[PDB]
Design an enzyme around this catalytic site. Structure first.
Site, PDB file in Angstrom:
ATOM      1  N   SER A   1      12.637  15.640  -2.446  1.00  0.00           N
ATOM      2  CA  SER A   1      11.404  14.897  -2.230  1.00  0.00           C
ATOM      3  C   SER A   1      10.232  15.865  -2.272  1.00  0.00           C
ATOM      4  O   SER A   1      10.400  17.070  -2.476  1.00  0.00           O
ATOM      5  CB  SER A   1      11.423  14.151  -0.896  1.00  0.00           C
ATOM      6  OG  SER A   1      11.219  15.047   0.180  1.00  0.00           O
TER       7      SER A   1
ATOM      8  N   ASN B   1       8.217   4.408  -0.783  1.00  0.00           N
ATOM      9  CA  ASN B   1       8.886   3.632   0.252  1.00  0.00           C
ATOM     10  C   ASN B   1       8.088   2.394   0.638  1.00  0.00           C
ATOM     11  O   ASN B   1       8.669   1.337   0.911  1.00  0.00           O
ATOM     12  CB  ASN B   1       9.139   4.516   1.472  1.00  0.00           C
ATOM     13  CG  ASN B   1       7.864   4.884   2.195  1.00  0.00           C
ATOM     14  OD1 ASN B   1       6.799   4.974   1.588  1.00  0.00           O
ATOM     15  ND2 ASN B   1       7.966   5.105   3.499  1.00  0.00           N
TER      16      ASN B   1
ATOM     17  N   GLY C   1      10.528  18.308   4.565  1.00  0.00           N
ATOM     18  CA  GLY C   1      10.418  19.551   5.306  1.00  0.00           C
ATOM     19  C   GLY C   1      11.117  20.713   4.621  1.00  0.00           C
ATOM     20  O   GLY C   1      10.666  21.857   4.709  1.00  0.00           O
ATOM     21  N   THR C   2      12.238  20.445   3.945  1.00  0.00           N
ATOM     22  CA  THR C   2      12.960  21.494   3.233  1.00  0.00           C
ATOM     23  C   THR C   2      13.221  21.196   1.768  1.00  0.00           C
ATOM     24  O   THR C   2      13.420  22.144   1.000  1.00  0.00           O
ATOM     25  CB  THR C   2      14.311  21.780   3.904  1.00  0.00           C
ATOM     26  OG1 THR C   2      15.209  20.697   3.645  1.00  0.00           O
ATOM     27  CG2 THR C   2      14.130  21.915   5.394  1.00  0.00           C
TER      28      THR C   2
ATOM     29  N   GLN D   1      17.811  16.884   3.589  1.00  0.00           N
ATOM     30  CA  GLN D   1      17.442  15.790   4.474  1.00  0.00           C
ATOM     31  C   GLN D   1      17.141  14.562   3.641  1.00  0.00           C
ATOM     32  O   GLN D   1      17.560  13.443   3.953  1.00  0.00           O
ATOM     33  CB  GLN D   1      16.138  16.138   5.175  1.00  0.00           C
ATOM     34  CG  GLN D   1      15.650  15.279   6.310  1.00  0.00           C
ATOM     35  CD  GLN D   1      16.339  15.593   7.604  1.00  0.00           C
ATOM     36  OE1 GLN D   1      17.259  14.909   8.032  1.00  0.00           O
ATOM     37  NE2 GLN D   1      15.847  16.631   8.267  1.00  0.00           N
TER      38      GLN D   1
ATOM     39  N   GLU E   1      19.956  21.984   7.661  1.00  0.00           N
ATOM     40  CA  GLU E   1      20.142  21.628   9.062  1.00  0.00           C
ATOM     41  C   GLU E   1      21.474  20.911   9.206  1.00  0.00           C
ATOM     42  O   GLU E   1      21.584  19.735   8.822  1.00  0.00           O
ATOM     43  CB  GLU E   1      19.000  20.739   9.547  1.00  0.00           C
ATOM     44  CG  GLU E   1      17.654  21.390   9.359  1.00  0.00           C
ATOM     45  CD  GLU E   1      17.071  21.113   7.987  1.00  0.00           C
ATOM     46  OE1 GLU E   1      17.845  20.794   7.060  1.00  0.00           O
ATOM     47  OE2 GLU E   1      15.850  21.273   7.821  1.00  0.00           O
TER      48      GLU E   1
ATOM     49  N   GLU F   1      17.358  11.499 -25.408  1.00  0.00           N
ATOM     50  CA  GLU F   1      16.441  10.576 -26.068  1.00  0.00           C
ATOM     51  C   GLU F   1      15.314  10.158 -25.136  1.00  0.00           C
ATOM     52  O   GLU F   1      14.168  10.014 -25.570  1.00  0.00           O
ATOM     53  CB  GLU F   1      17.197   9.349 -26.579  1.00  0.00           C
ATOM     54  CG  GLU F   1      17.966   9.541 -27.886  1.00  0.00           C
ATOM     55  CD  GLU F   1      19.133  10.508 -27.781  1.00  0.00           C
ATOM     56  OE1 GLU F   1      19.451  10.961 -26.662  1.00  0.00           O
ATOM     57  OE2 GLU F   1      19.750  10.798 -28.828  1.00  0.00           O
TER      58      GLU F   1
ATOM     59  N   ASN G   1      18.105   2.996   0.113  1.00  0.00           N
ATOM     60  CA  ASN G   1      19.014   3.863  -0.612  1.00  0.00           C
ATOM     61  C   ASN G   1      19.908   3.064  -1.542  1.00  0.00           C
ATOM     62  O   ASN G   1      20.207   3.524  -2.648  1.00  0.00           O
ATOM     63  CB  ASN G   1      19.854   4.667   0.378  1.00  0.00           C
ATOM     64  CG  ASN G   1      19.022   5.271   1.495  1.00  0.00           C
ATOM     65  OD1 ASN G   1      19.382   5.200   2.670  1.00  0.00           O
ATOM     66  ND2 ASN G   1      17.918   5.904   1.122  1.00  0.00           N
TER      67      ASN G   1
ATOM     68  N   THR H   1       3.584  10.930   7.320  1.00  0.00           N
ATOM     69  CA  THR H   1       4.346  11.302   8.506  1.00  0.00           C
ATOM     70  C   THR H   1       4.085  12.745   8.903  1.00  0.00           C
ATOM     71  O   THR H   1       4.013  13.056  10.096  1.00  0.00           O
ATOM     72  CB  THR H   1       5.837  11.083   8.271  1.00  0.00           C
ATOM     73  OG1 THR H   1       6.253  11.840   7.130  1.00  0.00           O
ATOM     74  CG2 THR H   1       6.124   9.612   8.035  1.00  0.00           C
TER      75      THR H   1
HETATM   76  N1  LIG Z   1      13.941  11.301   0.547  1.00  0.00           N
HETATM   77  C1  LIG Z   1      13.986  10.499   1.607  1.00  0.00           C
HETATM   78  N2  LIG Z   1      12.919  10.491   2.465  1.00  0.00           N
HETATM   79  C2  LIG Z   1      12.880   9.715   3.555  1.00  0.00           C
HETATM   80  C3  LIG Z   1      13.897   8.875   3.904  1.00  0.00           C
HETATM   81  N3  LIG Z   1      13.530   8.231   5.079  1.00  0.00           N
HETATM   82  C4  LIG Z   1      12.306   8.712   5.394  1.00  0.00           C
HETATM   83  N4  LIG Z   1      11.908   9.632   4.463  1.00  0.00           N
HETATM   84  C5  LIG Z   1      10.690  10.447   4.331  1.00  0.00           C
HETATM   85  O1  LIG Z   1      11.162  11.682   3.800  1.00  0.00           O
HETATM   86  C6  LIG Z   1      10.752  12.800   4.568  1.00  0.00           C
HETATM   87  C7  LIG Z   1      11.868  13.805   4.839  1.00  0.00           C
HETATM   88  O2  LIG Z   1      11.273  15.079   4.742  1.00  0.00           O
HETATM   89  P1  LIG Z   1      11.784  16.333   5.595  1.00  0.00           P
HETATM   90  O3  LIG Z   1      12.042  15.874   7.002  1.00  0.00           O
HETATM   91  O4  LIG Z   1      10.792  17.456   5.509  1.00  0.00           O
HETATM   92  O5  LIG Z   1      13.157  16.782   4.906  1.00  0.00           O
HETATM   93  P2  LIG Z   1      13.620  18.306   4.662  1.00  0.00           P
HETATM   94  O6  LIG Z   1      12.514  19.201   4.191  1.00  0.00           O
HETATM   95  O7  LIG Z   1      14.684  18.353   3.594  1.00  0.00           O
HETATM   96  O8  LIG Z   1      14.198  18.868   6.059  1.00  0.00           O
HETATM   97  P3  LIG Z   1      13.989  18.273   7.563  1.00  0.00           P
HETATM   98  O9  LIG Z   1      12.528  18.273   7.987  1.00  0.00           O
HETATM   99  O10 LIG Z   1      14.711  19.166   8.526  1.00  0.00           O
HETATM  100  O11 LIG Z   1      14.690  16.935   7.752  1.00  0.00           O
HETATM  101  C8  LIG Z   1      10.182  12.284   5.872  1.00  0.00           C
HETATM  102  O12 LIG Z   1       8.906  12.857   6.095  1.00  0.00           O
HETATM  103  C9  LIG Z   1      10.066  10.788   5.673  1.00  0.00           C
HETATM  104  O13 LIG Z   1       8.707  10.443   5.691  1.00  0.00           O
HETATM  105  C10 LIG Z   1      14.988   8.868   3.043  1.00  0.00           C
HETATM  106  O14 LIG Z   1      15.985   8.193   3.199  1.00  0.00           O
HETATM  107  N5  LIG Z   1      15.024   9.655   1.939  1.00  0.00           N
END
Ligand SMILES: Nc1nc2c(ncn2[C@@H]2O[C@H](COP(=O)(O)OP(=O)(O)OP(=O)(O)O)[C@@H](O)[C@H]2O)c(=O)[nH]1
Ligand SMILES: Nc1nc2c(ncn2[C@@H]2O[C@H](COP(=O)(O)OP(=O)(O)OP(=O)(O)O)[C@@H](O)[C@H]2O)c(=O)[nH]1
Ligand SMILES: Nc1nc2c(ncn2[C@@H]2O[C@H](COP(=O)(O)OP(=O)(O)OP(=O)(O)O)[C@@H](O)[C@H]2O)c(=O)[nH]1
EC number: 3.6.5.-
Lengths: 438, 100, 427, 300, 438
Positions: free
Chosen positions: A140, A206, A144-145, A11, A71, A254, A228, A179
């Site tokens: 990140s 952010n 969530g994942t 995500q 997802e 390095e 991005n 969030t």
């Molecule tokens: N890394 C990244 N984070 C973002 C972006 N836009 C918003 N976010 C923040 O990044 C977080 C995404 O985390 P998750 O939603 O848990 O992602 P995930 O664990 O890979 O899986 P999902 O919950 O299903 O989408 C959100 O909580 C946002 O606060 C973005 O473009 N890139």
């Protein structure tokens, strides 16, 4: 030869990857179909693309990347973009179930039956490659994942290889914006699991990105396209040393060997000074001295840490585009003379300077203007301890009330890790003040 | 949602009971030896019911008797949605008939 | 070449012979008259498995009718296809049935079996090489049983090398109308099982339940039931006449189905029976095909196999299929109910895939499985026979006809032997 | 006469040989599908040496295959067809260029006229190809090459495109019916001339074919298709009455069949000579003459 | 010269014969009508086609094959299909009655009065044959007919011709998927009757082909249009060395001499590495290294036996297309040095490499790829004895209860042979055990 493998879990990593490879193809001049124009650069996989794209006998520059996503919605979208014929079909590993923000749901219930496939991909890259300098992992902590499955893949790659660097970018949890409320839990879980395996983990925020946006981009309503795009240009800058040539040169090995002081502490910060717009670059003008001053202006960094509340110890400057070394060294000497800045004793020499002559490139229809001089700044300083102070006096309340632990324990977890993480973090901060003091 | 039985007309099926009609019929035969198979009609004004019969013919050959019991032959001019049964209002000398 | 000659016996052998032959003729595009109207090249090519070919393109059905009362023969005659039947084959007697198994087996048949045997061997000589004969009769029905027992008994020695396929209607457990039906059944089953190799068991109550369930039409005719059973039989018949991957042979089914010498009695089940709105409310997918295909309710032979298990099963499917879907559904059904089959032979399932669809709907199938699903039937007939025999009522007719009870004793003995064999093998 | 096959996928020129009858070859293949040197290079090399292109395999050509001088005379129709389809690297086949070439000369008009006139004696409206090539080489001073003369013959060919008529087909039908004992069409045609059901004039052939299949009429479906072709119209509703009257064998003679040998083939005996089999057989002057200069006569 | 005779016994053999022959005609350009237009490949009936055709005085390529079947249905459909006109009229031998899955039905009741005709046909082919390397026989163990008839034919041709060659390919019954509870019966009967005459037999599995089809070829609802075209590709691959020329070649006599260690044991396994679909071939890369790695991937095989449950003693590489010895030897050396494979100490080398330059060819309306580098895998291992343990315990209970034996005693079978079968099987068992022992 000189190549790195890209991995995007999530995500949190899909859109930034989309932007960065769009910039890559634009700058090398790849047509989004995949091939060159009548110019003669298709070959045995050895020209400027030999570092990033695997252009093979088919004539198509194939990115050396794998996206893994829990997802299938967003990954279906990215396949329904335009660069789909460019990207490799089963390098797009999709699933059917989310990790549902739960660190242990991601790490245990769904992840293990996907690591086999991702390992198969990475090994079928490991056979073809010869230089294999390392990986670019995107995830990140407020994911969530992107937390748990990422930790597991990190663990397997660490245990099978300890002979290559491990670079990590992260969109860090926002200090005061949350969030998700499972954010502190799964974030600290990721941290304490990953500390003893991560080579170079870097952060960005952010909120401060947006603050730059409406400060000097003159954009009071930017977007992800913009965010991005900025992060993609940052990583392009850090890979410019690999791609192009120059007078003096440095490599990511390095970076690791010359920025981290000790064991454990390997989380520095980054910045890019010349962030301006079309008319701004048009009737204004940039130069080395003010790009230095701007890149060390306290607000311009993308995390809310005041340098005067901390002390510098390491700095690596990457200048790209035309420049003479005279003004470079002179300006850094003047900053040494500066009285507002703070250097600890250990580092009388602390400036790793690296030049590439090739100008940075623009994206069509985007925000950034033409660039004559640009800089990527990577600094490590003691200041960031306050962020972990914040995180700990947050998590302590939830633990005192044993909030939300029912989900994790019901899907099968125990207090052990929850306890351990707090003193792992505590050791981290205590080391921070132990080294900050003199 | 739930079906129900259709409706029948006591007026039709009790008023004119066993009112029957008879006709003579000729056919076109593949075999040249069947040129005069004089066949007989029988109509019932009970359910617009039709039956067809063959009288024994002395020493000329073909066995007589019954070719088909009383039948609700749906009219060839009656589509699958509209079940006419060759309403006797059409029968006339030298008519055109196709059944089975 | 391989071909089949049909025998219809009894006043419901009439029933089904009429419905079955007319259904096949409509499938093959032969008019009610006989003038073939060629529209399916394959069926034109392989019509010889059932039909001889006459002048100008009419086809005699090599089928023979037997009865006693000329009125029923004349009624079926009067049917829309009695013209496509034979004045040749219209052999019949003069007596009255009396619904009497004893008379049929000893008095009435004694002057009809001769002529019918002449006709059947005439037809056998006329054609090249049978696979065998399918005989449609009744076990509860008096004269059908009385004839068929003797007929099969003689044809057994007549040809010891062919397929004596038999089709029998099981008396409604709730009511047999005729009260001597249990007596007739106990009399018949002995010679039936002794002489035959494969027997179909069908009961009227379950067809009525189907009519309530998915037909929902509330105004059924035994003719509608015959329509169903004609489709049922057509399902197993389609294999020989049709190309593609499929083991068509009835002997193939026999050697793949029949575990022991004396196991012969099998129970049918069939595939999508389309309801009021299911025409436009049903998606024809191998999952749902198998779902209804292996269901208790859609089963229509005897009684819920919920009580018992399945010894072995076989399934044929008409349409454009592939092996993977039947394969994977086999995996799923085996892993779902690991107990509901006998461990006695693992992987007890046989498959067959006719490439040819029916005319109008895309996918269909036929089910046939041998199970411990006849115990309750013959135990029922056991209690009825015992309760009625203990006071030997309604027996002076049979004494007058020339019977005695030692044969009754041995019949119930053999039948209890069947009960014991089933129970000891499976249980 | 050697098979030299140009493989456009690998630029290799396969050299194969067919055995002849009572002669001294007993050979066959000569060059395993191999790229071969241009015969105009050194042993000492500095720059990329060259190889045979597809530019010079023109009809009527000279070539060396590493030593042996090969000369090339004839061609097959499929090669010709692919030759003219795309002419960017094959300007030879483009006949209009030869049109301009022969249009360059004017004075020889009347001279060509009388030469060709005296060539004929009966004005039979054809001419032998050998004479044609000789007179054209003459008018070109021996400057024309084989290929464009071949192509112009191809263009202004005589038209002689025919097929077997119904005579064979009906004779074979009669004799096949003789074999199939079902000779008597009394059993079939009378049945049909009844079984016409709803008829005023003609009938859809989809009915005749299906009733044939029903009655098991002894014949192969291929001949069924052939005769149905030979008797058809825009709607395929022929007069079935005459159809059956003619397919019946109540009046017929009886021919029979020859061998399927290989003589009129091109590894067997036809002419295998300099006018190898024959490209276009015959050709006529007057059209080509008019196209060149045929003025002051008829419309021009 | 270099020419072979094909036998297609049974319902199954004759169809894949049709399919593979439809392959064969294309790569030499033979039309569905069997005559080319004016161009010439004809001669003394002696050129590349002469391996399988003999184009005689009527210019018609005649298959060097025979098709014997019991049920006339499919021979009728191929007598009415697209290729009956090219197939030789009375070669296509038809019967009138089936074999009914009974071995003794084909071996005592029907096969007797047809063997005369078929032997006469094969002798009047053998006379016009000159080199006669051998016979490619296609039967199937669980063959709903062909097993019993194939046993008789094979044994008689073995006894009358004890000097020429015999190679057997046969679809092997599945470990767990069933079409006949009687299949173990005729399987063990055929085995204990054939192991003492078969020179080398090769088994594959329909489920395995399917699993490949939906892992890599991306076929979610195959049929054996697809999978028969695959197996036809396999046989074309093994016979390409016969057809064409090249650097160094291989022959069936070499197969006989060098694949099998000992008498009795002559059961290797077959694989095709670069099974790949349109887009994957289009815009991905293939080379000797990765294709060899793939062909040695343990799940690519056509029979489910685990190589870690086994041990290798022989391998044959069939490299077709553009491949070269240096990378050949480099790849095989790396494979040797890799430790997952566990070769026995019998053969210090375990490899037989064969080269052909001519690339494999595609088929209209097909699934294969424009592949320049193909490699056929023919390897003999020790993993397979698990399957024979599987079959014998799948058989023992069912015999102990004696289901369907009444059928066989009625058609004229006794039980001495059924008894003998299991100790033949146990002989093969202990033999594999002992040869593995070291
Ligand atoms: N890394 C990244 N984070 C973002 C972006 N836009 C918003 N976010 C923040 O990044 C977080 C995404 O985390 P998750 O939603 O848990 O992602 P995930 O664990 O890979 O899986 P999902 O919950 O299903 O989408 C959100 O909580 C946002 O606060 C973005 O473009 N890139
Ligand atoms: N076509 C037709 N058959 C029926 C119908 N109703 C019942 N049958 C059954 O068919 C059974 C078998 O008839 P047969 O085989 O001819 O019996 P039988 O020996 O001639 O003497 P019976 O049993 O008295 O009829 C009867 O016992 C009826 O139960 C019906 O409505 N139509
Ligand atoms: N070669 C081939 N195999 C097929 C075809 N259709 C189904 N099969 C395969 O055939 C195998 C079974 O063959 P058998 O059932 O023993 O057929 P048979 O004994 O020769 O005789 P039949 O009664 O005609 O089936 C299965 O493994 C299927 O995969 C086909 O068209 N060609």
């Amino acid at each position: 030869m000189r190549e790195c493998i890209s991995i995007h879990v999530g995500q949190a990593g899909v859109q930034i990857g989309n932007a960065c490879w769009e910039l890559y193809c634009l700058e090398h001049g790849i047509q989004p179909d995949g091939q060159m124009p009548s110019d003669k650069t298709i070959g045995g996989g050895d020209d400027s693309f030999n570092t990033f794209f695997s252009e093979t006998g088919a004539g198509k520059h194939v990115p050396r990347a794998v996206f893994v996503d829990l997802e299938p919605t967003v990954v279906d979208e990215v396949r329904t973009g335009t660069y789909r014929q460019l990207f490799h079909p089963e390098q797009l590993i999709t699933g059917k179930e989310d990790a549902a923000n739960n660190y242990a749901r991601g790490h245990y219930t769904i992840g293990k039956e996907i690591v086999d496939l991702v390992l198969d991909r990475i090994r079928k890259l490991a056979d073809l490659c010869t230089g294999l300098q390392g990986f670019l992992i995107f995830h990140s902590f407020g994911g969530g994942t992107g937390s748990g499955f990422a930790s597991l893949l990190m663990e397997r790659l660490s245990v099978d290889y300890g002979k290559k660097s491990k670079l990590e970018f992260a969109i860090y949890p926002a200090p005061q914006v949350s969030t998700a409320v499972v954010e502190p839990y799964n974030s600290i879980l990721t941290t304490h699991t990953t500390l003893e395996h991560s080579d170079c983990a870097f952060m960005v925020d952010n909120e401060a990105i947006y603050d730059i946006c409406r400060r000097n981009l003159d954009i009071e309503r930017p977007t992800y396209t913009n965010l991005n795009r900025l992060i993609g240009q940052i990583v392009s800058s850090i890979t410019a040393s690999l791609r192009f040539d120059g007078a003096l040169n440095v490599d990511l090995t390095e970076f690791q060997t010359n920025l981290v002081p000790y064991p454990r502490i390997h989380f520095p910060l980054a910045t890019y000074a010349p962030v301006i717009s079309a008319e701004k670059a048009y009737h204004e003008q940039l130069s080395v001295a003010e790009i230095t001053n701007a890149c060390f202006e306290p607000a311009n960094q993308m995390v809310k840490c005041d340098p005067r509340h901390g002390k510098y110890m390491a700095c690596c400057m990457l200048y790209r585009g035309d420049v003479v070394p005279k003004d470079v060294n002179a300006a850094i000497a003047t900053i040494k003379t500066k009285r507002t800045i703070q250097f600890v004793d250990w580092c009388p020499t602390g400036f790793k300077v690296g030049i590439n002559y090739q100008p940075p490139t623009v994206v069509p229809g985007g925000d950034l203007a033409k660039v004559q001089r640009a800089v990527c700044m990577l600094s490590n300083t003691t200041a960031i301890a306050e962020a972990w102070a914040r995180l700990d006096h947050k998590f302590d309340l939830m633990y005192a009330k044993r909030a939300f632990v029912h989900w994790y324990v019901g899907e099968g977890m125990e207090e052990g890790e929850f306890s351990e993480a707090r003193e792992d973090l505590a050791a981290l901060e205590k080391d921070y003040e132990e080294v900050g003091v003199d | 949602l739930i079906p129900k039985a259709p409706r029948k007309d006591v007026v039709k099926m009790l008023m004119n009971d066993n009112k029957v009609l008879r006709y003579l019929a000729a056919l076109e035969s593949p075999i040249p030896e069947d040129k005069d198979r004089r066949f007989v009609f029988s109509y019932f004004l009970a359910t617009d019911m039709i039956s067809i019969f063959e009288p024994p013919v002395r020493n000329s050959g073909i066995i007589g008797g019954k070719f088909l019991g009383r039948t609700k032959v749906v009219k060839s001019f009656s589509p699958v949605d509209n079940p006419i049964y060759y309403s006797p209002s059409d029968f006339f000398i030298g008519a055109v008939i196709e059944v089975f | 070449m391989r071909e089949i000659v049909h025998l219809q016996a009894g006043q419901c052998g009439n029933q089904i012979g009429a419905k079955f032959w007319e259904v096949i003729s409509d499938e093959h595009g032969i008019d009610p008259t006989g003038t073939y109207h060629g529209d399916s090249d394959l069926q034109l090519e392989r019509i010889n498995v059932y039909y001889n070919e006459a002048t100008g393109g009419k086809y005699v059905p090599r089928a023979v009718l037997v009865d006693l009362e000329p009125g029923t023969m004349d009624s079926v005659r009067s049917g829309p296809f009695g013209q496509i039947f034979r004045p040749d084959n219209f052999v019949f007697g003069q007596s009255g049935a009396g619904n009497n198994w004893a008379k049929g087996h000893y008095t009435e048949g004694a002057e009809l079996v001769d002529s019918v045997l002449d006709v059947v061997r005439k037809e056998a000589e006329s054609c090249d090489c049978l696979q065998g004969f399918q005989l449609t009769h009744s076990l509860g029905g008096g004269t059908g049983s009385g004839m068929g027992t003797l007929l099969i008994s003689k044809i057994r020695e007549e040809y010891p090398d062919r397929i004596m396929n038999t089709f029998s209607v099981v008396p409604s457990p709730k009511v047999s109308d005729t009260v001597v039906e249990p007596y007739n059944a106990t009399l018949s089953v002995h010679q039936l099982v002794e002489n035959t190799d494969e027997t179909y068991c069908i009961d009227n109550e379950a067809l009525y339940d189907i009519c309530f369930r998915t037909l929902k039409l509330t105004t059924p005719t035994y003719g509608d039931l015959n329509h169903l059973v004609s489709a049922t039989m057509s399902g197993v018949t389609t294999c020989l006449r049709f190309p593609g991957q499929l083991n068509a042979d009835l002997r193939k089914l026999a050697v793949n189905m029949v575990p022991f010498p004396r196991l012969h009695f099998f129970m049918p089940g069939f595939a999508p029976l389309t309801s009021r709105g299911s025409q436009q409310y049903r998606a024809l997918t191998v999952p749902e095909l198998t779902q209804q295909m292996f269901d208790a309710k859609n089963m229509m032979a005897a009684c819920d196999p919920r009580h018992g298990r399945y010894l072995t099963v076989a399934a044929v499917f008409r349409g454009r299929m592939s092996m993977k879907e039947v394969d994977e559904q086999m995996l799923n059904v085996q892993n779902k109910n690991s107990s509901y089959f006998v461990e006695w032979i693992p992987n007890n399932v046989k498959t067959a895939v006719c490439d040819i669809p029916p005319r109008g709907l895309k996918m269909s199938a036929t089910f046939i499985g041998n199970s411990t699903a006849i115990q309750e039937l013959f135990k029922r007939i056991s209690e009825q026979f015992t309760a009625m025999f203990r006071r030997k009522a309604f027996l002076h007719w049979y004494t007058g006809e020339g019977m005695d009870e030692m044969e009754f004793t041995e019949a119930e003995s053999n039948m209890n032997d069947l009960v014991s064999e089933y129970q000891q093998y499976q249980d | 006469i050697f098979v030299i096959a140009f493989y456009l996928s690998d630029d290799t020129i396969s050299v194969f040989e067919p055995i002849e009858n009572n002669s001294g070859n007993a050979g066959g293949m000569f060059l395993k599908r191999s790229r071969v040197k241009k015969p105009g290079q050194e042993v000492f090399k500095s720059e990329f040496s060259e190889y045979i292109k597809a530019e010079e395999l023109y009809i009527g050509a000279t070539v060396n295959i590493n030593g042996y001088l090969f000369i090339l005379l004839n061609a097959d129709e499929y090669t010709l067809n692919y030759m003219e389809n795309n002419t960017d690297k094959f300007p030879y086949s483009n006949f209009e260029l030869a049109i301009q070439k022969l249009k360059q000369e004017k004075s020889k008009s009347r001279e060509i006229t009388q030469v060709f006139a005296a060539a004929d004696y009966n004005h039979t409206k054809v001419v032998p190809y050998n004479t044609f090539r000789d007179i054209l080489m003459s008018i070109t001073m021996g400057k024309l090459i084989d290929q464009e003369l071949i192509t112009i013959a191809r263009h202004y060919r005589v038209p002689e495109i025919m097929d077997p008529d119904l005579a064979y087909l009906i004779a074979r039908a009669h004799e096949k019916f003789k074999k199939n004992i079902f000779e008597n069409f009394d059993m079939f045609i009378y049945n049909c001339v009844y079984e016409d059901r709803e008829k005023k004039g003609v009938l859809p052939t989809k009915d005749i074919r299906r009733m044939c299949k029903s009655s098991r009429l002894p014949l192969d479906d291929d001949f069924l298709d052939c005769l149905l072709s030979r008797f058809e119209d825009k709607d395929h509703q022929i007069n079935y009455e005459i159809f059956f009257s003619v397919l019946n064998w109540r009046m017929n003679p009886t021919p029979d069949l020859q061998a399927p040998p290989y003589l009129k083939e091109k590894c067997e005996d036809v002419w295998v000579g300099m006018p190898s089999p024959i490209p276009v057989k015959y050709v006529r002057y007057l059209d080509f003459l008019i196209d060149v200069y045929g003025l002051e006569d008829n419309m021009l």
